[PDB]
């Protein structure tokens with residue numbers, strides 16, 4: 001029952017500073033433009049210890065399945081090959097991606113009826129807000 005409040009189907013309703021975050025990460029111009037247009041749905045489900053987060057958009061689909069605390073391979077929407085570890089910290093899903101000696105952290109939390117996602121690369125943060133679909 002860990003992540004019960006995250007489970008469901010969510011749609012993107014606001015984004016702030018995602019272009020600057022993508023620049024910080026190293027995403028190129030064309031990908032930033034097309035990815036920044038997308039309005040993904042995110043589908044979160046849990047089966048035993050396995051959490052699955054799917055992102056469906058016009059830009060890309062993606063899907064990750066993982067066990068908390070257990071590192072996995074992830075190919076990101078922008079085609080980085082990263083090593084990811086996702087934990088729960090005080091009710092927040094904390095997702096660290098490591099690649100090429102770099103690191104970024106993505107935090108997902110429930111706030112009121114929203115799922116709020118904060119992406120941080122060095123000093124740059126982006127906030128993306130999702131509502132139930």
Ligand SMILES: COc1c(C)c(C)c2onc(C)c2c1C/C=C(\C)CCC(=O)O
Nearest residue numbers: 022027035040055077078106117119128
């Ligand atoms: C941040 O990693 C990226 C990137 C870099 C780019 C270009 C992207 O383009 N499309 C997606 C989807 C996407 C993502 C995943 C987003 C997140 C893991 C959280 C924000 C959200 O779920 O909205």
